Design an enzyme around this catalytic site. Structure first.
Site, PDB file in Angstrom:
ATOM      1  CG  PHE A  55      -1.994   0.999   1.297  1.00  0.00           C
ATOM      2  CD1 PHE A  55      -1.736   2.269   1.808  1.00  0.00           C
ATOM      3  CD2 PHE A  55      -3.281   0.740   0.821  1.00  0.00           C
ATOM      4  CE1 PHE A  55      -2.736   3.230   1.853  1.00  0.00           C
ATOM      5  CE2 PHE A  55      -4.274   1.708   0.854  1.00  0.00           C
ATOM      6  CZ  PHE A  55      -4.003   2.946   1.374  1.00  0.00           C
ATOM      7  CG  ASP A  56       2.958   4.760  -2.563  1.00  0.00           C
ATOM      8  OD1 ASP A  56       3.608   5.236  -1.626  1.00  0.00           O
ATOM      9  OD2 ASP A  56       2.842   5.312  -3.698  1.00  0.00           O
TER      10      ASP A  56
ATOM     11  CB  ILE B 281       1.193   3.686 -14.513  1.00  0.00           C
ATOM     12  CG1 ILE B 281       0.203   4.172 -13.423  1.00  0.00           C
ATOM     13  CG2 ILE B 281       2.363   2.883 -13.931  1.00  0.00           C
ATOM     14  CD1 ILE B 281      -0.606   3.059 -12.744  1.00  0.00           C
TER      15      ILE B 281
ATOM     16  CE1 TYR C  42       5.411   1.068 -12.484  1.00  0.00           C
ATOM     17  CE2 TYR C  42       3.330   0.527 -11.421  1.00  0.00           C
ATOM     18  CZ  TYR C  42       4.399   1.398 -11.601  1.00  0.00           C
ATOM     19  OH  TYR C  42       4.423   2.577 -10.918  1.00  0.00           O
TER      20      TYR C  42
ATOM     21  CG  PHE D  85      -3.701   4.209  -7.884  1.00  0.00           C
ATOM     22  CD1 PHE D  85      -3.513   3.296  -8.911  1.00  0.00           C
ATOM     23  CD2 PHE D  85      -2.573   4.707  -7.221  1.00  0.00           C
ATOM     24  CE1 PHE D  85      -2.243   2.849  -9.252  1.00  0.00           C
ATOM     25  CE2 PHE D  85      -1.295   4.291  -7.589  1.00  0.00           C
ATOM     26  CZ  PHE D  85      -1.135   3.365  -8.609  1.00  0.00           C
TER      27      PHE D  85
END
Ligand SMILES: COc1cc([C@@H](C(=O)N2CCCC[C@H]2C(=O)OCc2cnn(C(C)C)c2)C2CCCCC2)cc(OC)c1OC
Length: 121
Positions: free
Chosen positions: A48-49, A68, A94, A111
């Site tokens: 998790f970012d 991205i 990715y 997101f």
């Protein structure tokens, strides 16, 4: 696997739900400086970012491939003040090579994005 397909090829690679509506009609143009908060995770929820983990707006130049593909596509649909969720297949993130160690091969990402502001540089 719900959301509006906002890809050009209509392949369901990027699915979008508006969670909170923004203000105005305007969305940002390619080359605009964009300010967001986001939280993001792998579908396999082992990473998790968050921009909130610094409490600092995340900033980038829209449509330049600095992020991205799904972001450049996705944030371009957003109104200032909007909060949206994107579910993202690997072709728009990715891909088959991934980005070790963070991102494994063929990863699906999620997101939550708040668009704060954008300006023409
Ligand atoms: C692959 O490298 C990274 C990917 C991300 C995160 C990510 O995939 N992004 C960060 C937020 C913008 C979308 C997307 C991305 O394009 O990140 C690459 C990136 C990181 N910083 N930048 C700036 C130079 C604009 C681009 C993932 C989300 C899922 C949970 C794990 C992290 C954050 C990162 O750190 C903030 C990364 O490290 C540089």
């Amino acid at each position: 696997e719900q959301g509006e397909d906002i890809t050009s090829k209509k392949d369901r690679g990027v699915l979008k739900i508006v969670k909170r509506v923004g203000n105005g009609e305007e969305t940002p143009m390619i080359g605009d400086k964009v300010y967001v908060h986001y939280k993001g995770k792998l579908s396999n929820g082992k990473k998790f970012d968050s921009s909130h983990d610094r409490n600092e707006p995340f900033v980038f130049s829209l449509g330049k491939g600095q992020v991205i593909k799904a972001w450049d596509i996705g944030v371009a649909t957003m109104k200032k003040g909007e909060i949206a969720h994107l579910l993202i297949k690997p072709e728009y993130a990715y891909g088959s090579a991934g980005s070790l160690p963070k991102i494994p091969s063929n990863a699906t990402l999620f997101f939550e994005i708040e668009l704060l502001d954008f300006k023409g540089e």
